[PDB]
Structures are given as structure tokens and as C-alpha cells.
From a paper:
Inteins are dynamic intervening protein elements that invade at the DNA level and are transcribed and translated along with the host protein. DnaB is the replicative helicase in bacteria and an essential component of the replication machinery. The two inteins in the dnaB gene of M. smegmatis (Msm) are different from each other in sequence, insertion site, and splicing mechanism. The first Msm intein, DnaBi1, lacks a HEN, necessary for invasion of novel sites, and is considered a mini-intein.
To understand the mechanism of disulfide bond formation, a crystal structure of the class 3 DnaBi1 intein was solved to 1.95 Å resolution. Class 3 inteins have several unique attributes, most notably three highly conserved residues in splicing blocks B, F, and G, termed the WCT triplet, that characterizes this class. This structure displayed the classic intein shape, with the β-strand fold indicative of the Hedgehog/Intein (HINT) domain. Class 3 inteins lack a nucleophilic residue at the start of the intein sequence, instead using a conserved internal block F cysteine (top). This internal cysteine (Cys118 for DnaBi1) attacks the N-extein–intein junction (step 1), akin to Cys1 of class 1 inteins. The catalytic center of DnaBi1 is composed of several key residues, including the WCT triplet (left). Catalytic Cys118 is centrally positioned in the active site (left), allowing interactions with both splice junctions. One of the three DnaBi1 molecules within the asymmetric unit, chain B, showed the thiol sidechain of Cys118 adopting two distinct conformations, a and b. Conformation a of Cys118 has 36% occupancy and is the unique orientation for this structure, while conformation b has 64% occupancy and is representative of the Cys118 orientation in the two other molecules in the asymmetric unit. However, both Cys118 conformations are distant from Cys48 (Cys118a, 11.0 Å and Cys118b, 12.1 Å). The thiol sidechains for both residues also rotate inward towards each other. This modeling suggests that subtle conformational shifts can bring the cysteines within proximity and implies that the β-strand containing Cys48 is likely responsible for closing that distance.
Residue numbers in the entry: 1 to 88, 101 to 139
Write the structure that this text describes.
């Protein structure tokens, strides 16, 4: 679900969606370590999007990647400018557009909100 070069913060620093492994730790919605308990393979040919945020960062995600908004969970294909990604100043989605397909990959974490931080802005996103 996220492009492989997406940076993801960890308790030791940074990894990428391309490098993170089951058993590694990401950061949960409160910044605390959260364990990666499952993943996908690298997936090809999926329809991809750029999501641009108000903190000046951007994440490439596939159509079906899930985001926690003020309106509940929304997939990338349903995001619209003006929404925010929240965990309960929430960063705001400034733009969403299609982009040519790149390899993507998803992971699952084990905190009860099923959220991890993504991108250089540490934006909340849903497993």
C-alpha cells in the first residue's frame, strides 16, 4: 500500500516501507514503539496516488491504502483536499492526484488503533 521509498520512523531512527520487516518496530499514534506483526510482498501494477499534506510532506500510496480522517477511515481513492489525518494541530491533506504505478507494500502493527507514523512528517496512517 505505500511506495517503497516512503520513510517510516522507528525507535532507533528511520527505515523505509521497502526495508521494514515483521518483528521490527515502527511508531504508533502516540509516538511509542509498535510492533510490525504482518506484511505484504512488494506489489506491482497497483494504481498509485500522491497525497500532499499541509506540513510540506507527501506520501505515495495505492488506491486502497487506508487513512484515519475526521470522517472515519477513508481509502486513498476517496481522500479529498481539506480532510485531516487524525489519531482521536492535525495535519491537513492539501492535494490528492494519480501518479504512475510504483511498487508498494503494506504492514500491520499491533496497537489498538492500528496506526503507524509515515513520511518525514510522521503523519498517522492506518495499517
Amino acid at each position: 500500500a505505500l511506495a517503497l521509498d516512503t520513510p517510516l520512523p522507528t525507535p532507533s531512527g528511520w527505515t523505509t516501507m521497502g526495508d521494514v520487516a515483521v518483528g521490527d518496530h515502527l511508531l504508533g499514534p502516540d509516538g511509542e514503539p509498535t510492533r510490525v506483526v504482518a506484511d505484504t510482498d512488494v506489489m506491482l501494477g497497483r494504481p498509485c496516488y500522491v497525497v500532499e499534506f499541509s506540513d510540506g510532506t507527501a506520501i505515495v500510496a495505492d488506491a486502497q491504502h487506508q487513512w484515519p480522517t475526521e470522517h472515519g477511515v477513508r481509502i486513498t481513492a476517496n481522500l479529498r483536499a481539506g480532510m485531516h489525518t487524525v489519531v482521536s494541530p492535525a495535519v491537513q491533506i492539501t492535494a490528492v492526484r494519480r501518479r504512475p504505478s510504483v511498487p508498494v507494500r503494506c504492514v500491520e502493527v499491533d496497537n489498538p488503533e492500528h496506526l503507524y507514523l509515515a513520511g518525514p512528517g510522521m503523519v498517522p496512517t492506518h495499517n
